[PDB]
Design a binder for this molecule. Structure first.
Ligand SMILES: Nc1nc2c(ncn2[C@@H]2O[C@H](COP(=O)(O)CP(=O)(O)OP(=O)(O)O)[C@@H](O)[C@H]2O)c(=O)[nH]1
Ligand SMILES: Nc1nc2c(ncn2[C@@H]2O[C@H](COP(=O)(O)CP(=O)(O)OP(=O)(O)O)[C@@H](O)[C@H]2O)c(=O)[nH]1
Ligand SMILES: Nc1nc2c(ncn2[C@@H]2O[C@H](COP(=O)(O)OP(=O)(O)OP(=O)(O)O)[C@@H](O)[C@H]2O)c(=O)[nH]1
Ligand SMILES: Nc1nc2c(ncn2[C@@H]2O[C@H](COP(=O)(O)OP(=O)(O)OP(=O)(O)O)[C@@H](O)[C@H]2O)c(=O)[nH]1
Lengths: 426, 427, 427, 426
C-alpha cells in the first residue's frame, strides 16, 4: 500500500540518506540489527511503506546505495546502522568520477546503470504498489550530478506515471568546495528541470547559518546538518507513514505545490530548532512555532524570501493541536504579509497534520515553499557558470568523453529560461 | 585503489629513502618487514605477515643502489626492485636518455608491467626525479615517453627539483631543463616543482635549523607527498582521490605547472608556545615567502587552489578561513575561475619521526596552487639559457652524444611558446 | 518406483561422490551404511539395518576409482560396483568408444542387468557424463547405443557438462562434442547441459565465493538432480514422476535439449537479511544471467517450462507468480505452446550439508526449460569446429584409432540438420 | 596399473635421470637404502607406477642405466642414491664412442642392443601394463645420440602401440662443448622425428639464463640444472603419480599437444623459481605464477616465443587452488596475446591439476608448449651442419664404420622438411 523506493547516490547523498534511515528507524522503534521493539502499534501499522518483512521478526530497508568508490560504502557499512541495509544493494564501481559530470553520466554511468536498473526493478516488483522514487544527490561534484541524473532519466523512461522526488543539495558562492561546481550544477539542472516532478533545493550555507543562529552549536559537523535535513525528509513522508486528521501524501502536496511542471524547486524548512540550554525559555505553542516556520532566517535556503513572492507554501504539522489555531495562524500569516504573497492566487497556503509527533518533542512542523526567491540562487550560479564558460575554461577534460560545447550552451539556455520563468510570475 | 611510486636519480632515490621510513612509521611497519586497507595502497601482502612496497628505485650509477642495499632498510624492500645501471649520466640529458638508458629500459618496462599486472586498482603513477641534473632528466623523459605511448590515459604525478636564481649546483642545468621540458610539456599530466633555496629558507626562518641537510629538506617533502595521498590511504569526511589533481587543477591540457607549499612548520619548543588553528596556517600557506619555490605570487594571479587538511578539523572553520582569504585583497584571483578553491579533509593526523626535526601538531594543511608566477621563473631560465646558447657553451658534450642544434632550437621555441601561453592565459 | 544412477568419467564420478553425500544426509544414512519408502527409490535394503545405492561408477583410468575406494564413503558403496578400466581415454572419443570400452562393457552390461533384475519398479536410468572430454563422450555413447537397442522404451536422463565460449579445459572438445552428439541425438530421450563459466558466475555474483572449486560447483548440481527426483522420493501435494520430463517437455522426438537453472542461491549472512518468497525466486530463475548455460534466452523463445518447487509453498502464490510472469513481456514464449507451464510442488524442503556453502532456505525451485537459445551455442560449436576441420587439426589421433573423415562429415551434416530443425521450429 | 619403463643413456642423460629419481624418491619419502618412511598414504598408493615391491618392505626402481664407459656407472653408483638402483640393470661396455654417432649406432650399439633388449623386455614383463617408455639423452656427443636412437627404434619396432617419451637436451651456438655436435644433432633428429611420439627439447643456455635471471646463483654447476629439469620431469608425471580433480596422463597431454605426428617437439617450463633470499618478497598466488609460466625468459628453451606463434600449450598445476582463478587466468592469457596464438584453433590451452604439491612449496606448475619458435633453434643447427658438410669436413671418421654421405644428405633433407613444416603453420 503506497510503498516508497529509496535510492542514494553520492557522498553527501548516502550520508544524509543513512541519517534519514537512522532517525526514522529510531522513530519506528527498530533495532540496529533489524528487529522491532516499538511500543505503539501505529509504528508497525505502516512499517511496510519502507521496510520489507523478513524472517525472525526482522525488517530490512528498501534502500539502494550506489557509489562510484568503495570508501562511501565502507563508511556507511561501518556506521551505526550499516548492518541493517541489504548486502545485495551495495552496488559500486572501482574508479571515481573525479568531480566530472561527463564521467559520471557517460563512462561509468553507462557501466553502472545496467547494474542498478535490475536492482531497482526487483525492489519495485517486491512491493505491492510503488508510490514514488525518492532520491538524494548533490549538484556539486561529478558522481551524484551525473549518475543520479542518469538514473532519474532512466527511471522516468521506465515509469512515466509515478512521482519523482529529489532532495538535491546545491552550491553557494560563499561556500564552494569544488572548482567544477558551477559546471556540474549547470549540467545537472538541465536534467532535473525536465525529468523530476518534485525537487527540494538545499544549501549548505543555509544550514550553517541555521546552526550559528538558532542552534548556537560550538563545533557543528556534517552530522548535525544530516540530522537537520533528515527532519524535513521525515516531515514530508510522515503523512503516509502515520494517520492524521488531514492526510497529505506526496502526490497531495505536489498537486498543491506544483502550479506548473517546471516551477517545482521548493524551499524546505523545519522547526522547532533551539539549543538544549534555551529549551526551557521557549513556549512550544503553535503561534511561536508558526512564526519560526515563516521566519526568513529559519529556511534551509540562502535566498531572502522577502526579496521575492511566494508562489505557494505548505505546512505539515505533527502532534496534537487545534485546527482553529492552525487556521487562524495561517490566516494572519497570509494576511499581514499580503505584499509577499502573489495576488493572483486567493490562498497560497496548504495545511496537513499528523497525530504522532517525533520522540522527544510534543509538537513539530515542516515548511515546503515554492517562491521566486530561488531565482537569486539560480542566477548567481548561472553567471558563475558563464564567467568560466565564456573563455572555454575547464572543458578539455569534458571533451575527452565525447561531450560537446553545444550541450553546455543548451544548459545555459535552459538556465536562462528557468530564471526568466521564475521572474515572469514575480 | 593503489598507486606505484617510482624514483629516478640521486634526488629521487634519496627522497624515496627519506619518505618510505615515514610511510612505514605511519602504517606501523617495522624495518624488518612485519608489524587492514590503509596500507593496501602502497604496500602489498605476501602470503602471511609480510609486506613489500609498490615502488622501484632506478639509477644509472650504482653508488646510490649499493648504499641503499647495505643501509638499514634492507629487509623492507625487495632486493630485485632496486635497479642499477653501469655508467654515469654525468649531468648529460643525451647520455642519460640514449646511450645508457637503452640497455636497462627493457628490464624496467617489463618489471613495472608485471608488478602492475598483479595489481588491479591502480589509480596511476607518481615519478620522483630532478630536471636540474642528467639522470633525472634523461631517464625520466625516456621512460615517460614510452609509458605515455603505452598507457596514456593513466595519470602521472611528476615531482621535480629546479635550481634557484642566484644558486645552482651544476652548470648545465638550464640546458638540461629546457631540453627535458620540451618532452615534459605534453606527456606529464601534472608536475610539482620545488626550489632548493626556498626549502632552505623555510627551515631557516621558521624551523630554526641553522645548519640543515638534504635529509631535513626531504623530510617535509615526504610529509607533503604523503599528505596528498593520505586521503586515499585513510578515511575522511571529504575524501579526494588522485583524479582530483588532474580534473580540478589542470584547466588546460598544457598549463599543468602548480606550485607547492605546506603548513605548519615548527620546532618542538616553539610548538608548545604557538597555538594551532586553521586561520594562521591558512594565512601562512598563501604567504609568499612561505612557498617552496622562489617566485612572487603578488606579481601574478592564482588560477586554482586545492587545500588538503589533515587532523581533527571541522569543515566550518576552514570554510570561514577560505571565506576571509577570498575577501582579503592582498592576493588576487583570476577572473576566469572565481570558484578557485577545492577544500578536502582527512581525519588521520600528521605523524612525527623519532628524533626528527618536525614537531607534533594536531592539524596540518598542504596547498598545491596553480598560478602564473612560474612564468617569470621560466622566462628567467630561458634568459640564462640564451647567454650560453649564443656562445655555444657546453654544446660539444651534447653533440658528441648524438644530438644536434635542431632540438636545442625546438626547445628554445617551445619555451617561447610556453611563455606565450602563460602571458595569454594570465590576461 | 526406482531409478538407477550411473556415472562415467572424472566429471561423472566427482558429481556422484559430491551428490551421494547429499542423498545420504537427506535420507539420514550415516557414512558407515546404517541409520520407510523415501529411501527405497535410490537405496536398497541389505537384510537388516544396512543400505546400498542403486548406482555404478565406471571409468577407464583407475585414478578416480582408487581414491573413491580409499576415501571416507568406503563402507556405503559396494566394493564391486566401482568399475575400473586399465587404459586412459586421453580426450579421445574413438579410444574411449572402441579400444578400451570393448573389454569392460561386457562386465558393465551384465552388472546393470543383474542389479536391475532384482528391481521391479524401475522408472528409468540417469547417466552422468561430460561430452567435453574423452571418457564421458566415448564410453557414454558406447553404453547408450547398446542400452537403447536392448531396452529402448525405458527413459534415460542425460547430464552433460559443455565448454564455455571463451574458456575451455581441453583442446579437442568440439571434435568430441560433434562426434558424440551424432549418436546422442537419436538415443537420448532428454539431456540437460551445463556450462562451466555459468556455474562459476552463479556462485561469484550471488553466493559471493571469490575462490570456488569443483566441489562447490557440484554441490548445487547435486541439489538440482536431487530436487528433480524429490517428488518421487517424498510425498507432495502435486507429485511429478520421471515420465513427466519425457511427455511434457519433449514436443518432438529429436528436439530434446533443455537448459537448467535453480533458485534461490544465497550465502549464510545474506540469507538472514533477504526474505524468501516465491515471487523473487520466480523472477530470478527466468533471469538470463542466472542460468547454468551461457546462452541468451532473449535472442530466442521458450518452447516449454516445468517448475518444480520444494518446501512449504501453497499452489496459489506460485499460480500468481506464473501468471505475472506470463503477463511480463520481457520474456517471449512461442505461439505453438501458449500453455507451456508445468507446476509441481513437494513438501520436503531443501537440506544443507554441514559446513557447506549453501544456506538454509525455507523454499526453493528448479527450472528446466526447453528453449531455442541452445541453437546459438550449437552454431558456435560448429563454427569453431570448422576452423580446425579445414586444417585437419587433431585428426591423426582419431584416424590412428580406427575412424576416418566420413563419420566426421556425417557429424558435421548432422549438426547442420540440427541447426536447420532449430531455426525451423523457432519460426 | 599404468607402469612406466625408465631408460637412461649418455652422461647428461643418466645424471638428470639420477636426479629425477632422487627428487621423486624424496617426494615419496623413500630412504636411500630403499625403505619407505613417508607420512601420506597417497605416496604408497601409487609407488608401484615406478618402484617394484621387494622383501623387507624394500622398493627398487624400475630404472635401466646404459653407458658405453664404466665411469658414468661408477659415478652414479657413488652418488647419494646410487645404491637404490638394481645392480643387474648396470649394463655397460668397455670402449667409449669418442663423440661419434656412427660408433654409437653401428659398432658398439649393435654389440650392446642385444644386451639391453632382454633387460627392458624383462622389466616390461614384470609390470602389469606398461604405459610408455620415458628416455633421457643428448643430441650432442656420440654415445647418447647413437645408442638412445637405436634403442628407441628397436623399442618402437617391439611396441608400436605404446607411448615413446623423450627429454632430449640439444646444443646451441653460444654454448657448444663438442666439435661434432651439429653432425650428431642432425643425425639424431632424423631418428627422433620419425620414431618418438613425444619430445621435450631442452637447451643448456636456456637453463643458464634461468639461473642468472631468477635464481641468481653465484656458482651454478650441473647439479642445479639437473634439479631444474627434474622439476618439469616430475611435473609431467605427477598426474598418474597422484590423484587430481582433473587428471591428465601422458597420453592425455599428448593428444592435446600433438596436433600432427611430426610437430611433437615441446618447450618445457616450470615455476616458481626464485632465490631463497627473495622468496619472502614474492607472492606465490596463481596470477603471479601464471605470468611466470608464460614469461618469455622463464621457458627452458633459447627461442623467443614472441617471434613465433604457439601451436598449443599445456599447464599442469600442483597444489590446492581455485579452478575459476586458473580458468580466468588462462582466459586473459590467451585473449590479451591473441596475436601470439594461432587463429585456426579456438582454444590453444590445456589444463590439468594435482592435489599434492612438492614438499617445501604450497603451489607449483609446469608448462609444456609446442610453438613455431623452435624452428629458429632448428635452422641454426641446420646451417651449422651445412657449413661443415658442404666441404665434407669431419666425415673420414664416420666413413670408417660404413656410414655413407647419402645418410647425411637424407638427414639434411629431413631437417629442411621439419623446419618448413614448422614454418607452414606460423
Ligand atoms: N550537509 C553535508 N554536505 C556535504 C557532506 N559531504 C559533502 N558535502 C557537500 O556536498 C558537496 C559535493 O557533494 P559530494 O561530497 O557527494 C561529491 P561526489 O561524491 O558526488 O563526487 P566524487 O566524490 O568526486 O565521486 C560537497 O562539496 C559538500 O559541500 C555531508 O556529509 N553533509
Ligand atoms: N644440464 C647438464 N648438461 C650436461 C651435463 N653433462 C654434460 N652436459 C651437456 O650435454 C653435452 C653432451 O652430453 P654428454 O656429456 O652425455 C656426451 P655422451 O656421454 O653422450 O658421449 P661420450 O661421453 O663421448 O661417450 C655436453 O657437451 C654438455 O653440454 C650435465 O651434467 N648437466
Ligand atoms: N632537494 C634536493 N636535491 C637534490 C638532492 N640530491 C640531489 N639533488 C639535485 O639533483 C641534481 C643532480 O641530479 P642527478 O643528475 O641525478 O645527479 P647524479 O645522481 O649525481 O647523476 P650523475 O652526476 O650524472 O652521476 C643536483 O643539481 C641537485 O640539486 C637532495 O637530496 N635534495
Ligand atoms: N563441472 C565440472 N566439470 C568437470 C569436473 N571434472 C571434470 N570436468 C570436465 O570433464 C572434462 C574432461 O572429462 P574426461 O574425458 O572424463 O577427462 P578424464 O577423466 O581426465 O579422462 P582422461 O584425460 O582421458 O584420462 C574436462 O574438460 C572438465 O571440464 C567437475 O568436477 N565439475
Amino acid at each position: 500500500m503506497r510503498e516508497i523506493v529509496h535510492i542514494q547516490a553520492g557522498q553527501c547523498g548516502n550520508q544524509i540518506g543513512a541519517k534519514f534511515w537512522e532517525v526514522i528507524s529510531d522513530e519506528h522503534g527498530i533495532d540496529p540489527t533489524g528487529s522491532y521493539h516499538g511500543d505503539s502499534d501505529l509504528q508497525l501499522e505502516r512499517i511496510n511503506v519502507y521496510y520489507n518483512e523478513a524472517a525472525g521478526n526482522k525488517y530490512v530497508p528498501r534502500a539502494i546505495l550506489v557509489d562510484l568508490e568503495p570508501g562511501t560504502m565502507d563508511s556507511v557499512r561501518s556506521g551505526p546502522f550499516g548492518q541493517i541495509f541489504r548486502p545485495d544493494n551495495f552496488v559500486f564501481g572501482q574508479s571515481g568520477a573525479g568531480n566530472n559530470w561527463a564521467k559520471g553520466h557517460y563512462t561509468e554511468g553507462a557501466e553502472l546503470v545496467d547494474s542498478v536498473l535490475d536492482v531497482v526493478r526487483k525492489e519495485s516488483e517486491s512491493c505491492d504498489c510503488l508510490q514514488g522514487f525518492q532520491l538524494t544527490h548533490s549538484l556539486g561534484g561529478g558522481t551524484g550530478s551525473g549518475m543520479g541524473t542518469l538514473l532519474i532519466s532512466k527511471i522516468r523512461e521506465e515509469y512515466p506515471d509515478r512521482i519523482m522526488n529529489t532532495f538535491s543539495v546545491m552550491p553557494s558562492p560563499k561556500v564552494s568546495d569544488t572548482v567544477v561546481e558551477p559546471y556540474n550544477a549547470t549540467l545537472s539542472v538541465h536534467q532535473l528541470v525536465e525529468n523530476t516532478d518534485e525537487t527540494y533545493s538545499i544549501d549548505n550555507e543555509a544550514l550553517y547559518d541555521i546552526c550559528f543562529r538558532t542552534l548556537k552549536l560550538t563545533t557543528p559537523t556534517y552530522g548535525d546538518l544530516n540530522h537537520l535535513v533528515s527532519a524535513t525528509m521525515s516531515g514530508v513522508t510522515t503523512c503516509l507513514r502515520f494517520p492524521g486528521q488531514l492526510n497529505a501524501d506526496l502526490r497531495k502536496l505536489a498537486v498543491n505545490m506544483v502550479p506548473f511542471p517546471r516551477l517545482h524547486f521548493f524551499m524546505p524548512g523545519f522547526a522547532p530548532l533551539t539549543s538544549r540550554g534555551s529549551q526551557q525559555y521557549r513556549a512550544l505553542t503553535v503561534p511561536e512555532l508558526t512564526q519560526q516556520m515563516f521566519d526568513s532566517k529559519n529556511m534551509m535556503a540562502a535566498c531572502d524570501p522577502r526579496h521575492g513572492r511566494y508562489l505557494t507554501v505548505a505546512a505539515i504539522f505533527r502532534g496534537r493541536m487545534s485546527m482553529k489555531e492552525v487556521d487562524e495562524q495561517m490566516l494572519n500569516v497570509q494576511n499581514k504579509n499580503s505584499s509577499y504573497f502573489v495576488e493572483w492566487i486567493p490562498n497560497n497556503v496548504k495545511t496537513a497534520v499528523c497525530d504522532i509527533p517525533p520522540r522527544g518533542l510534543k509538537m513539530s512542523a515542516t515548511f515546503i515553499g515554492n517562491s521566486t526567491a530561488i531565482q537569486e540562487l539560480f542566477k548567481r550560479i548561472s553567471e558563475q557558470f558563464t564567467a568560466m564558460f565564456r573563455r572555454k575554461a575547464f572543458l578539455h577534460w569534458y571533451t575527452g568523453e565525447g561531450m560537446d560545447e553545444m550541450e553546455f550552451t543548451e544548459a545555459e539556455s535552459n538556465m536562462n529560461d528557468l530564471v526568466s520563468e521564475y521572474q515572469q510570475y514575480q | 585503489r593503489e598507486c606505484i611510486s617510482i624514483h629516478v636519480g640521486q634526488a629521487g632515490v634519496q627522497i624515496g629513502n627519506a619518505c618510505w621510513e615515514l610511510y612505514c612509521l605511519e602504517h606501523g611497519i617495522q624495518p624488518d618487514g612485519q608489524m587492514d586497507d590503509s596500507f593496501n595502497t602502497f604496500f602489498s601482502e605476501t602470503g602471511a605477515g609480510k609486506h613489500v612496497p609498490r615502488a622501484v628505485f632506478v639509477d644509472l650509477e650504482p653508488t646510490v643502489i649499493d648504499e641503499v642495499r647495505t643501509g638499514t632498510y634492507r629487509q623492507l624492500f625487495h632486493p630485485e626492485q632496486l635497479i642499477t645501471g653501469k655508467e654515469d649520466a654525468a649531468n648529460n640529458y643525451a647520455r642519460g636518455h640514449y646511450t645508457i638508458g637503452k640497455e636497462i629500459i627493457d628490464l624496467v618496462l617489463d618489471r613495472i608491467r608485471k608488478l602492475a599486472d598483479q595489481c588491479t586498482g591502480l589509480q596511476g603513477f607518481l615519478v620522483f626525479h630532478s630536471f636540474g641534473g642528467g639522470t633525472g632528466s634523461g631517464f625520466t623523459s625516456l621512460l615517460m615517453e614510452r609509458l605515455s605511448v603505452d598507457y596514456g590515459k593513466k595519470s602521472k604525478l611528476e615531482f621535480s627539483i629546479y635550481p634557484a636564481p642566484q644558486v645552482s649546483t651544476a652548470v648545465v642545468e638550464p640546458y638540461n631543463s629546457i631540453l627535458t621540458t620540451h618532452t615534459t610539456l605534453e606527456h606529464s599530466d601534472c608536475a610539482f616543482m620545488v626550489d632548493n633555496e626556498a626549502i632552505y629558507d623555510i627551515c631557516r626562518r621558521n624551523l630554526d635549523i641553522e645548519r640543515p641537510t638534504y635529509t631535513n629538506l626531504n623530510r617535509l617533502i615526504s610529509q607533503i607527498v604523503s599528505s596528498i595521498t593520505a586521503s586515499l590511504r585513510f578515511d575522511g569526511a571529504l575524501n579526494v582521490d588522485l583524479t582530483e589533481f588532474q580534473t580540478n587543477l589542470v584547466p588546460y591540457p598544457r598549463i599543468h605547472f602548480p606550485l607547492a607549499t605546506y603548513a605548519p612548520v615548527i620546532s618542538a619548543e616553539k610548538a608548545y608556545h604557538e597555538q594551532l588553528t586553521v586561520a594562521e596556517i591558512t594565512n601562512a600557506c598563501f604567504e609568499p615567502a612561505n612557498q617552496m619555490v622562489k617566485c612572487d605570487p603578488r606579481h601574478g594571479k592564482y588560477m586554482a587552489c586545492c587545500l588538503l587538511y589533515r587532523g581533527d578539523v571541522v569543515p566550518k572553520d576552514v570554510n570561514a578561513a577560505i571565506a576571509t582569504i577570498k575577501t582579503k585583497r592582498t592576493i588576487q584571483f583570476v577572473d576566469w575561475c572565481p570558484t578557485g578553491f577545492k577544500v578536502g579533509i582527512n581525519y588521520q593526523p600528521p605523524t612525527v619521526v623519532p628524533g626528527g626535526d618536525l614537531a607534533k601538531v594536531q592539524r596540518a594543511v598542504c596547498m598545491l596552487s596553480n598560478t602564473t608566477a612560474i612564468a617569470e621563473a621560466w622566462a628567467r631560465l630561458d634568459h640564462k639559457f640564451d647567454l650560453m646558447y649564443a656562445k655555444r657553451a657546453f654544446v660539444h658534450w651534447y653533440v658528441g652524444e648524438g644530438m644536434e642544434e635542431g632540438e636545442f632550437s625546438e626547445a628554445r621555441e617551445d619555451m617561447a611558446a610556453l611563455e606565450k601561453d602563460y602571458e595569454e592565459v594570465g590576461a
